């Protein structure tokens, strides 16, 4: 017996197809009340917008726009620039802001009313470092994408602080085949342990090079910063014998997960795919899984709080919203168990710094879960118990 | 206009608010969480903008109405790299406090892939006092080019 | 050293690629002359002789 609206900001270039997460977002809207259990007497609606690449001023508008009505809580943009203002704004007006990307929060900022389902790297980069520290490498190359890659990995760069991993860092140029100058050195420096950092969009790009650069052998052992490792196309590679390694958080070990994905894959590709890119079009990418779970994680908090009503909140004013402080800290206890496994924000900072990474690797058959990681227990490698008394 | 450090929304107002009078070249906030916000406006409103600090430079923000008299870190980072290799040093230790110090110094961090060096990297924690252990380690570690 | 009409060469080569045998190590020699007719590009960087 109730309707409720969220906000929404997304990106595009002047038109559709809509932001594939937005397209996949409105889904998590609908799927709520078809698991009717979920917020039964409180039907959820929403509002969205679409904003610029490399901008927040427009996103400031669409922020203030979605604040004209006011919205119960905003799910936010892609760029940091776009999502840092949306952070402050909501957090200068009580509104909860939500995040699914990573972006380096300046550690001199006062803010509260934002959270980021994105699993932070101070764990990821710890996990990398564990994994590395297991394969007993005494060397590694860290290929990243752009400057901010560093700040993403600084746990790793600081492994020589304690550990004999004399590593080197190499940055990809603009294009994919802008790799060849780089890789050529690697093969000439003979750097047979490679950790990347780039959205998989460069992975397939960088990989087809590592193939055409004759670096797909048993020798090289590529490790990927990202999770969407699975989204790529195994097949061209799985025979060469290469060792490859990456993590996984879209916990496909659950039928429901493997159904919802499928139920989403039942609907996802109503847009035409892209063949050459090397992605398994039909595998719901992580970046969307969060924008999905968020909806649940977020709206489950609403399933604690009766008094909430969206309100017209103008940027002309200063007036913070009513129940933000009452509603915001509801979030930081939302221990939702969805696609990305356990979900529980580090209440100190409000970041998802606890989760289960299941390390996948490349056996000739495909991508095999071979070990499970968490912040707490380190690495359970299925290989660990390959001999018993 | 005087405002609080690290609040964009707050910082966003004065940008347009000044423009309610119109200004020629705003001289922006010196801390990127705000600086870009202003920058997000200046070329978005045709207005040129003048900046002093380095800021969390982004790859391809399509503004062009912003400059700064400040020397780009690349030149700086290259400049140290001139200096160190000049001093023939090998086992350097870079020491910062904030993550952005990396981007401040990547032109240097990348170099060992080209110039035979070694460089640990260490970070000053939240409090200033917290360096006493750092120095202690940097004492434990015998680092004589910092 | 192979022996097959190039029709198998491209076939056998795309394998030698997907079988991780396109390195500086292996040195493939072809019985046939139509070696040129194949498509160099996928290979010329791997360093193979």
Coordinates of C-alpha atoms in Angstrom, one line a residue:
Chain A
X1 CA 0.0 0.0 0.0
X2 CA 2.9 2.3 -0.8
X3 CA 5.0 3.6 -3.6
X4 CA 8.6 4.8 -3.4
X5 CA 11.1 6.3 -5.7
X6 CA 14.9 6.2 -6.0
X7 CA 17.1 8.4 -8.1
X8 CA 19.3 7.3 -10.9
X9 CA 22.2 8.7 -12.9
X10 CA 23.9 7.0 -15.8
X11 CA 25.9 7.6 -18.9
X12 CA 25.5 7.3 -22.6
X13 CA 26.4 9.3 -25.7
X14 CA 23.4 11.5 -26.6
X15 CA 21.1 8.4 -26.8
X16 CA 20.5 4.7 -26.3
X17 CA 21.1 1.9 -25.8
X18 CA 20.9 3.1 -22.2
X19 CA 23.7 2.5 -19.8
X20 CA 23.9 -1.3 -19.7
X21 CA 23.7 -1.1 -15.9
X22 CA 20.8 1.3 -16.0
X23 CA 19.1 -1.2 -18.4
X24 CA 20.1 -3.8 -15.9
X25 CA 19.2 -1.6 -13.0
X26 CA 15.5 -1.1 -13.7
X27 CA 15.5 -4.8 -13.6
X28 CA 16.4 -5.0 -10.0
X29 CA 13.6 -2.5 -9.5
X30 CA 11.1 -4.8 -11.0
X31 CA 12.4 -8.1 -9.7
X32 CA 11.8 -6.9 -6.2
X33 CA 8.0 -7.2 -6.2
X34 CA 8.1 -10.5 -8.1
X35 CA 9.8 -12.0 -5.2
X36 CA 6.8 -10.4 -3.7
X37 CA 8.2 -11.2 -0.2
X38 CA 10.4 -8.1 -0.8
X39 CA 8.9 -4.9 0.6
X40 CA 5.4 -6.1 0.0
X41 CA 3.2 -3.3 1.2
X42 CA 5.7 -0.8 -0.2
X43 CA 5.9 -0.9 -4.0
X44 CA 9.1 0.6 -5.2
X45 CA 9.4 2.9 -8.2
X46 CA 12.4 5.0 -9.3
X47 CA 13.6 7.9 -11.5
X48 CA 16.8 8.0 -13.6
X49 CA 18.8 10.4 -15.6
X50 CA 21.7 10.2 -18.0
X51 CA 24.8 12.3 -17.8
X52 CA 28.1 13.3 -19.4
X53 CA 31.5 11.5 -19.7
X54 CA 34.1 13.5 -17.8
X55 CA 31.7 15.8 -16.0
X56 CA 29.8 16.4 -12.8
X57 CA 28.3 19.9 -13.4
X58 CA 25.6 18.3 -15.6
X59 CA 25.5 15.6 -12.9
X60 CA 25.1 18.4 -10.4
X61 CA 22.0 19.4 -12.4
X62 CA 20.6 15.9 -12.6
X63 CA 21.5 15.7 -8.9
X64 CA 19.6 18.8 -8.1
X65 CA 17.0 17.6 -10.7
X66 CA 16.4 14.3 -9.0
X67 CA 16.4 16.4 -5.8
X68 CA 13.6 18.6 -7.2
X69 CA 11.2 15.8 -6.3
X70 CA 13.8 14.6 -4.0
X71 CA 14.5 10.9 -4.2
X72 CA 14.8 8.4 -1.4
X73 CA 18.4 7.6 -2.3
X74 CA 20.6 8.1 -5.4
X75 CA 22.4 5.4 -7.2
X76 CA 25.3 7.1 -8.8
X77 CA 27.5 7.7 -11.9
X78 CA 30.7 6.2 -13.3
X79 CA 33.4 8.8 -13.1
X80 CA 34.9 9.8 -9.7
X81 CA 34.5 13.4 -10.8
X82 CA 30.9 12.6 -11.6
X83 CA 30.4 10.7 -8.3
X84 CA 32.3 12.9 -5.9
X85 CA 30.0 15.8 -6.3
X86 CA 26.9 13.6 -6.1
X87 CA 28.6 12.3 -3.0
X88 CA 28.9 15.7 -1.3
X89 CA 25.5 16.9 -2.5
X90 CA 23.5 14.0 -1.1
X91 CA 25.7 14.2 2.0
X92 CA 25.2 18.0 2.2
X93 CA 21.5 17.3 2.0
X94 CA 21.1 14.2 4.1
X95 CA 20.3 12.0 1.1
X96 CA 22.1 8.7 1.0
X97 CA 24.4 8.3 -2.0
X98 CA 25.3 4.9 -3.3
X99 CA 28.3 3.8 -5.3
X100 CA 29.2 0.7 -7.3
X101 CA 32.5 1.8 -8.7
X102 CA 35.8 2.2 -7.0
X103 CA 37.3 5.7 -6.7
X104 CA 39.9 7.0 -4.3
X105 CA 38.2 8.7 -1.5
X106 CA 40.5 11.5 -0.4
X107 CA 41.4 10.6 3.1
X108 CA 40.8 14.2 4.2
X109 CA 37.1 14.3 3.5
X110 CA 34.5 14.4 6.3
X111 CA 31.7 12.6 4.5
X112 CA 29.2 10.0 5.7
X113 CA 26.1 9.7 3.4
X114 CA 27.7 7.6 0.7
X115 CA 28.6 4.0 0.4
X116 CA 30.2 1.9 -2.3
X117 CA 29.3 -1.7 -2.8
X118 CA 32.5 -1.9 -4.8
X119 CA 34.9 -4.3 -3.0
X120 CA 37.8 -2.2 -1.9
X121 CA 41.3 -2.9 -3.0
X122 CA 43.0 -2.6 0.4
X123 CA 41.5 -6.1 0.5
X124 CA 41.7 -7.0 -3.2
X125 CA 45.3 -5.8 -3.5
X126 CA 45.9 -7.7 -0.3
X127 CA 44.5 -10.8 -1.9
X128 CA 46.6 -10.2 -5.1
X129 CA 49.6 -9.9 -2.8
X130 CA 48.6 -13.2 -1.0
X131 CA 48.1 -15.1 -4.2
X132 CA 51.5 -13.7 -5.5
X133 CA 53.1 -14.5 -2.2
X134 CA 51.9 -18.0 -2.6
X135 CA 53.2 -18.8 -6.1
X136 CA 56.5 -17.8 -4.5
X137 CA 57.3 -15.3 -7.2
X138 CA 60.3 -13.2 -6.5
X139 CA 59.5 -10.8 -9.3
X140 CA 56.4 -9.4 -11.0
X141 CA 55.4 -6.8 -13.6
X142 CA 52.5 -4.6 -12.7
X143 CA 50.9 -3.4 -16.0
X144 CA 48.3 -0.8 -15.3
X145 CA 45.9 1.3 -17.4
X146 CA 46.1 4.9 -16.1
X147 CA 47.6 6.9 -13.2
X148 CA 44.8 6.0 -10.8
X149 CA 45.7 2.4 -11.3
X150 CA 48.5 3.1 -8.9
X151 CA 46.4 4.4 -6.0
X152 CA 44.3 1.3 -6.7
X153 CA 47.3 -1.0 -6.1
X154 CA 49.3 0.8 -3.5
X155 CA 49.1 -2.2 -1.1
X156 CA 50.9 -4.1 -3.8
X157 CA 53.6 -1.6 -4.7
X158 CA 54.4 -1.6 -1.0
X159 CA 55.2 -5.4 -0.9
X160 CA 58.9 -4.7 -1.2
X161 CA 58.3 -2.9 2.1
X162 CA 58.6 -6.4 3.7
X163 CA 58.8 -8.9 0.9
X164 CA 61.5 -9.7 -1.7
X165 CA 59.4 -8.9 -4.7
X166 CA 61.5 -6.7 -6.8
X167 CA 58.8 -5.6 -9.1
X168 CA 58.5 -3.3 -12.1
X169 CA 55.7 -1.2 -13.2
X170 CA 54.6 -0.5 -16.8
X171 CA 51.8 1.6 -18.1
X172 CA 49.8 0.8 -21.2
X173 CA 49.6 3.6 -23.8
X174 CA 46.3 4.8 -25.4
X175 CA 45.3 1.9 -27.7
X176 CA 45.3 -1.8 -27.4
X177 CA 48.0 -2.4 -30.1
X178 CA 49.6 0.4 -28.3
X179 CA 50.6 -2.7 -26.2
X180 CA 53.1 -4.2 -28.6
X181 CA 55.8 -1.7 -27.8
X182 CA 55.3 -2.6 -24.1
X183 CA 55.0 -6.3 -24.4
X184 CA 57.9 -6.4 -26.7
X185 CA 60.1 -5.2 -23.9
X186 CA 58.5 -7.7 -21.5
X187 CA 59.5 -10.6 -23.8
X188 CA 62.9 -8.9 -24.1
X189 CA 63.2 -8.3 -20.4
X190 CA 61.7 -11.8 -19.9
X191 CA 59.2 -10.8 -17.2
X192 CA 57.2 -14.1 -16.9
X193 CA 54.9 -13.0 -14.1
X194 CA 52.4 -10.3 -15.1
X195 CA 49.8 -8.6 -13.0
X196 CA 47.5 -6.4 -15.0
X197 CA 45.4 -3.4 -14.1
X198 CA 42.7 -2.4 -16.6
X199 CA 39.0 -2.9 -17.2
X200 CA 38.7 -6.2 -19.1
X201 CA 38.0 -4.1 -22.1
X202 CA 41.7 -3.8 -22.3
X203 CA 42.2 -7.4 -21.1
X204 CA 40.9 -8.8 -24.3
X205 CA 42.8 -6.1 -26.0
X206 CA 46.0 -6.8 -24.1
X207 CA 45.5 -10.6 -24.4
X208 CA 45.0 -10.8 -28.2
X209 CA 48.4 -9.1 -28.1
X210 CA 49.9 -11.5 -25.7
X211 CA 48.8 -14.1 -28.2
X212 CA 50.1 -12.3 -31.3
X213 CA 53.1 -11.3 -29.3
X214 CA 53.9 -14.9 -28.7
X215 CA 53.5 -14.6 -24.9
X216 CA 50.8 -17.3 -24.5
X217 CA 53.0 -20.2 -23.3
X218 CA 53.4 -22.2 -20.2
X219 CA 56.0 -19.6 -19.1
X220 CA 54.0 -16.5 -18.7
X221 CA 51.5 -16.4 -15.8
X222 CA 49.0 -13.6 -16.2
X223 CA 47.1 -12.3 -13.2
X224 CA 44.3 -9.8 -13.5
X225 CA 43.3 -7.1 -11.2
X226 CA 39.6 -7.3 -12.2
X227 CA 36.9 -9.8 -11.5
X228 CA 35.3 -9.9 -15.0
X229 CA 38.1 -12.2 -16.0
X230 CA 35.4 -14.7 -16.5
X231 CA 33.5 -12.5 -18.9
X232 CA 36.3 -12.8 -21.5
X233 CA 36.4 -15.6 -24.1
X234 CA 38.5 -18.5 -22.7
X235 CA 38.7 -20.6 -25.8
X236 CA 41.4 -18.9 -27.9
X237 CA 43.8 -19.5 -24.9
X238 CA 42.9 -22.5 -22.9
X239 CA 45.1 -24.8 -24.9
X240 CA 48.4 -22.8 -25.0
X241 CA 49.1 -24.1 -21.5
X242 CA 49.4 -20.6 -19.9
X243 CA 48.8 -20.3 -16.2
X244 CA 46.3 -17.5 -15.6
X245 CA 44.7 -16.3 -12.5
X246 CA 42.0 -13.9 -11.4
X247 CA 39.3 -13.5 -8.7
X248 CA 35.6 -13.9 -8.8
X249 CA 32.9 -12.2 -6.7
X250 CA 29.8 -12.8 -8.8
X251 CA 29.2 -15.9 -6.7
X252 CA 27.9 -18.2 -9.5
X253 CA 28.1 -21.2 -7.1
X254 CA 24.5 -20.4 -6.2
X255 CA 21.8 -21.8 -8.5
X256 CA 19.7 -18.7 -7.8
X257 CA 22.7 -16.6 -8.7
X258 CA 23.2 -18.8 -11.7
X259 CA 19.4 -18.5 -12.3
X260 CA 19.0 -14.8 -11.8
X261 CA 22.0 -14.3 -14.0
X262 CA 20.4 -16.7 -16.5
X263 CA 17.0 -15.0 -15.8
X264 CA 18.9 -11.8 -16.6
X265 CA 20.8 -13.4 -19.4
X266 CA 17.3 -14.4 -20.5
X267 CA 16.8 -10.7 -20.9
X268 CA 20.2 -9.0 -21.0
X269 CA 21.0 -9.6 -24.7
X270 CA 17.9 -8.0 -26.0
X271 CA 20.7 -5.6 -27.3
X272 CA 23.0 -7.0 -30.1
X273 CA 26.3 -8.3 -28.9
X274 CA 29.9 -7.6 -30.0
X275 CA 31.8 -10.6 -31.4
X276 CA 35.4 -9.5 -31.8
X277 CA 35.7 -8.0 -28.3
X278 CA 36.2 -11.4 -26.9
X279 CA 33.5 -11.2 -24.2
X280 CA 31.0 -14.0 -23.4
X281 CA 28.0 -11.8 -24.2
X282 CA 25.3 -13.2 -22.0
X283 CA 27.5 -13.3 -18.8
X284 CA 26.1 -10.5 -16.6
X285 CA 29.2 -8.5 -15.7
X286 CA 30.1 -7.7 -12.1
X287 CA 29.6 -3.9 -12.6
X288 CA 25.9 -4.7 -12.9
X289 CA 25.8 -7.4 -10.2
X290 CA 26.4 -4.6 -7.7
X291 CA 23.9 -2.2 -9.1
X292 CA 21.6 -5.2 -8.7
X293 CA 22.5 -6.2 -5.1
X294 CA 22.6 -2.6 -4.0
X295 CA 18.9 -2.3 -4.8
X296 CA 18.3 -5.2 -2.4
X297 CA 20.9 -4.2 0.1
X298 CA 19.6 -0.6 0.0
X299 CA 15.9 -1.3 -0.1
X300 CA 16.2 -4.0 2.6
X301 CA 17.1 -1.1 4.9
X302 CA 13.7 0.4 3.9
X303 CA 12.3 -2.9 5.2
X304 CA 13.4 -1.6 8.6
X305 CA 12.2 1.9 8.5
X306 CA 8.5 3.0 8.2
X307 CA 8.6 6.7 8.6
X308 CA 10.4 7.6 5.3
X309 CA 8.8 9.8 2.7
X310 CA 10.6 11.4 -0.2
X311 CA 10.6 15.2 0.0
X312 CA 11.1 18.1 -2.4
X313 CA 14.6 19.2 -1.5
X314 CA 16.0 22.2 -3.4
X315 CA 19.7 23.0 -4.0
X316 CA 18.7 26.6 -3.5
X317 CA 18.2 25.7 0.2
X318 CA 20.5 24.2 2.8
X319 CA 17.9 22.2 4.6
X320 CA 19.1 18.6 5.1
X321 CA 16.5 15.9 4.7
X322 CA 14.6 14.5 7.6
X323 CA 15.6 10.9 8.3
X324 CA 19.0 10.7 6.6
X325 CA 20.9 10.4 9.8
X326 CA 18.2 8.0 10.9
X327 CA 18.1 6.2 7.6
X328 CA 21.7 6.4 6.5
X329 CA 23.2 4.3 9.4
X330 CA 20.5 1.7 8.7
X331 CA 22.5 0.9 5.5
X332 CA 25.8 0.1 7.3
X333 CA 24.2 -2.9 8.9
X334 CA 22.6 -4.3 5.7
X335 CA 24.1 -7.9 5.8
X336 CA 22.5 -8.9 2.5
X337 CA 23.4 -12.2 0.9
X338 CA 23.1 -11.8 -2.9
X339 CA 24.9 -12.2 -6.1
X340 CA 28.2 -10.9 -4.8
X341 CA 28.0 -13.1 -1.7
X342 CA 28.2 -11.7 1.7
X343 CA 27.6 -8.0 1.8
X344 CA 28.6 -6.0 4.9
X345 CA 30.0 -2.5 4.9
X346 CA 33.0 -1.7 7.1
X347 CA 31.1 0.4 9.5
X348 CA 34.1 2.6 10.3
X349 CA 34.3 3.9 6.7
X350 CA 31.2 2.5 5.1
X351 CA 33.0 0.5 2.4
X352 CA 32.5 -3.1 1.4
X353 CA 35.8 -4.3 2.8
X354 CA 34.6 -7.9 3.6
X355 CA 33.6 -10.4 1.0
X356 CA 34.7 -13.7 -0.5
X357 CA 37.0 -13.9 -3.4
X358 CA 37.0 -17.3 -5.1
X359 CA 40.2 -17.4 -7.1
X360 CA 39.6 -18.8 -10.6
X361 CA 42.3 -19.9 -13.0
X362 CA 42.7 -21.2 -16.5
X363 CA 42.8 -24.9 -17.0
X364 CA 42.5 -26.3 -20.5
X365 CA 38.8 -27.0 -19.8
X366 CA 38.0 -23.4 -18.8
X367 CA 37.9 -21.1 -15.8
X368 CA 38.0 -23.2 -12.7
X369 CA 37.4 -22.0 -9.2
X370 CA 40.6 -23.2 -7.5
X371 CA 40.7 -21.4 -4.2
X372 CA 38.6 -19.2 -1.9
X373 CA 39.8 -16.0 -0.3
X374 CA 38.4 -13.6 2.3
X375 CA 39.8 -10.8 4.3
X376 CA 40.0 -13.0 7.4
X377 CA 41.1 -16.6 6.6
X378 CA 43.5 -15.7 3.8
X379 CA 43.7 -18.3 1.0
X380 CA 41.9 -21.5 1.1
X381 CA 43.4 -23.1 -2.0
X382 CA 41.7 -26.4 -2.9
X383 CA 45.2 -27.5 -3.8
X384 CA 46.2 -27.1 -0.1
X385 CA 44.6 -30.4 0.9
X386 CA 46.0 -32.5 -2.0
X387 CA 47.6 -34.9 0.5
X388 CA 46.2 -36.3 3.8
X389 CA 47.6 -38.7 6.4
Chain B
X1 CA 34.3 33.7 -1.3
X2 CA 35.3 31.7 1.8
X3 CA 34.2 28.2 2.2
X4 CA 35.0 24.8 3.9
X5 CA 37.8 22.6 2.7
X6 CA 36.5 19.4 1.1
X7 CA 32.9 20.1 0.3
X8 CA 32.0 20.3 -3.4
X9 CA 28.3 21.1 -3.2
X10 CA 29.2 23.9 -0.8
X11 CA 32.0 24.8 -3.2
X12 CA 29.7 24.5 -6.2
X13 CA 27.4 27.4 -5.1
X14 CA 29.9 30.2 -5.1
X15 CA 30.9 29.2 -8.6
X16 CA 27.5 29.9 -10.0
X17 CA 26.8 32.4 -7.2
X18 CA 29.7 34.6 -8.3
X19 CA 28.5 34.2 -11.8
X20 CA 25.2 35.7 -10.7
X21 CA 27.4 38.8 -10.8
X22 CA 29.6 37.4 -13.5
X23 CA 33.4 37.1 -13.0
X24 CA 36.2 36.8 -15.5
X25 CA 38.6 34.2 -14.2
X26 CA 37.7 32.4 -10.9
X27 CA 40.7 31.4 -9.0
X28 CA 39.6 28.1 -7.7
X29 CA 39.9 26.0 -4.6
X30 CA 43.2 24.4 -4.1
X31 CA 42.0 20.8 -3.3
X32 CA 40.8 18.6 -6.1
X33 CA 37.5 17.3 -4.6
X34 CA 36.5 20.9 -5.1
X35 CA 38.8 22.1 -7.8
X36 CA 37.3 19.8 -10.4
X37 CA 33.8 20.8 -9.4
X38 CA 34.7 24.4 -10.3
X39 CA 36.5 23.1 -13.3
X40 CA 33.4 21.1 -14.2
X41 CA 31.7 24.5 -14.5
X42 CA 34.2 26.9 -16.0
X43 CA 34.5 25.4 -19.4
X44 CA 31.0 24.1 -19.0
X45 CA 30.1 27.8 -19.0
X46 CA 32.7 29.1 -21.4
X47 CA 34.5 30.8 -18.5
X48 CA 38.3 30.4 -18.2
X49 CA 39.7 29.4 -14.9
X50 CA 43.1 29.7 -13.1
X51 CA 44.5 27.1 -10.8
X52 CA 47.5 26.9 -8.4
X53 CA 47.8 23.4 -6.9
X54 CA 48.3 20.2 -8.8
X55 CA 45.0 18.3 -8.7
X56 CA 43.9 14.7 -9.1
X57 CA 44.4 15.0 -12.9
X58 CA 41.9 12.9 -14.9
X59 CA 42.7 11.4 -18.3
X60 CA 40.3 13.1 -20.6
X61 CA 38.2 15.6 -18.9
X62 CA 37.1 17.7 -21.8
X63 CA 37.5 21.1 -20.2
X64 CA 40.0 23.4 -21.8
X65 CA 39.3 26.7 -19.9
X66 CA 41.6 25.8 -17.0
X67 CA 45.3 26.3 -16.7
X68 CA 47.7 26.6 -13.8
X69 CA 51.0 28.3 -13.2
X70 CA 52.1 25.2 -11.4
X71 CA 54.8 22.9 -12.9
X72 CA 53.3 19.7 -14.0
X73 CA 54.4 16.7 -11.8
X74 CA 55.7 14.9 -14.9
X75 CA 58.3 17.5 -15.3
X76 CA 58.9 17.5 -11.5
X77 CA 58.9 13.7 -11.4
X78 CA 61.2 13.7 -14.4
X79 CA 63.3 16.3 -12.6
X80 CA 64.0 14.2 -9.5
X81 CA 64.7 11.4 -11.9
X82 CA 67.3 13.7 -13.5
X83 CA 68.6 14.4 -10.0
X84 CA 68.8 10.9 -8.6
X85 CA 70.4 9.3 -11.7
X86 CA 72.7 12.3 -11.5
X87 CA 73.6 11.3 -8.0
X88 CA 74.2 7.8 -9.3
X89 CA 71.9 6.6 -6.5
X90 CA 70.6 3.1 -6.7
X91 CA 68.5 2.1 -3.6
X92 CA 66.2 5.0 -3.2
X93 CA 63.1 5.0 -1.0
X94 CA 60.2 7.2 -1.9
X95 CA 58.2 8.4 1.1
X96 CA 54.8 10.0 0.9
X97 CA 51.6 10.4 2.9
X98 CA 48.7 10.6 0.5
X99 CA 47.8 8.1 -2.3
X100 CA 48.0 11.0 -4.8
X101 CA 51.7 11.1 -4.1
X102 CA 52.0 8.1 -6.3
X103 CA 50.5 10.0 -9.3
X104 CA 52.7 12.8 -8.2
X105 CA 55.7 10.5 -8.7
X106 CA 54.8 7.8 -11.3
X107 CA 57.3 9.2 -13.8
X108 CA 59.8 8.1 -11.2
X109 CA 58.2 4.8 -10.0
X110 CA 58.2 3.6 -13.5
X111 CA 61.9 4.4 -14.1
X112 CA 63.5 1.3 -12.5
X113 CA 62.1 -0.6 -15.4
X114 CA 64.6 1.5 -17.3
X115 CA 67.3 2.7 -15.0
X116 CA 68.9 0.2 -12.6
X117 CA 67.5 1.3 -9.3
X118 CA 65.5 -0.1 -6.4
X119 CA 62.8 1.8 -4.6
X120 CA 60.7 0.8 -1.7
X121 CA 57.7 3.0 -1.1
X122 CA 56.4 3.9 2.4
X123 CA 53.5 6.0 3.6
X124 CA 53.1 8.4 6.5
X125 CA 49.9 7.3 8.3
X126 CA 47.0 9.4 9.6
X127 CA 49.0 11.0 12.4
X128 CA 52.3 12.7 12.1
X129 CA 53.8 10.9 15.0
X130 CA 53.2 7.6 13.2
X131 CA 56.5 8.1 11.4
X132 CA 58.5 7.2 14.5
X133 CA 57.9 3.5 13.5
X134 CA 58.4 4.4 9.8
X135 CA 61.7 6.0 10.6
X136 CA 62.3 3.0 12.8
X137 CA 61.8 0.7 9.9
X138 CA 63.7 3.0 7.6
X139 CA 66.3 2.6 10.4
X140 CA 65.7 -1.2 10.4
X141 CA 66.1 -1.0 6.6
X142 CA 69.2 1.1 6.3
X143 CA 67.8 3.5 3.6
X144 CA 70.3 6.3 2.9
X145 CA 68.7 7.9 -0.1
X146 CA 65.3 9.1 0.9
Chain C
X1 CA 58.8 -29.7 -41.5
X2 CA 55.3 -30.0 -42.7
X3 CA 53.8 -31.8 -45.7
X4 CA 50.3 -30.7 -46.7
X5 CA 48.6 -28.4 -49.2
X6 CA 48.5 -25.0 -47.5
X7 CA 44.8 -25.6 -47.0
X8 CA 46.1 -27.6 -44.0
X9 CA 48.9 -25.1 -43.3
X10 CA 46.5 -22.4 -42.2
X11 CA 44.6 -25.1 -40.4
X12 CA 47.7 -26.5 -38.8
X13 CA 49.0 -23.0 -38.1
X14 CA 46.0 -21.7 -36.3
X15 CA 46.5 -24.7 -34.1
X16 CA 50.2 -24.0 -33.6
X17 CA 49.0 -20.7 -32.4
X18 CA 46.2 -21.9 -30.2
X19 CA 48.5 -24.7 -29.1
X20 CA 51.1 -22.2 -27.9
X21 CA 53.7 -23.2 -30.4
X22 CA 54.2 -19.8 -32.0
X23 CA 57.4 -18.8 -30.2
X24 CA 60.9 -18.0 -31.1
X25 CA 61.6 -21.7 -30.3
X26 CA 59.7 -23.6 -32.9
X27 CA 60.9 -23.2 -36.5
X28 CA 58.3 -24.4 -39.0
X29 CA 59.4 -25.3 -42.5
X30 CA 56.8 -26.0 -45.2
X31 CA 57.0 -28.5 -48.1
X32 CA 54.9 -26.3 -50.3
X33 CA 55.5 -23.1 -52.2
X34 CA 52.1 -21.4 -51.4
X35 CA 53.5 -20.5 -48.1
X36 CA 53.2 -16.9 -49.3
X37 CA 49.5 -17.3 -50.0
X38 CA 48.7 -17.6 -46.3
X39 CA 48.0 -14.7 -44.1
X40 CA 51.3 -13.6 -42.4
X41 CA 49.9 -11.0 -40.0
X42 CA 48.6 -13.2 -37.1
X43 CA 52.1 -14.6 -36.8
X44 CA 54.8 -12.2 -37.8
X45 CA 55.2 -10.7 -34.3
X46 CA 55.4 -13.9 -32.2
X47 CA 59.1 -14.1 -33.2
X48 CA 58.8 -17.5 -34.8
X49 CA 61.3 -18.6 -37.4

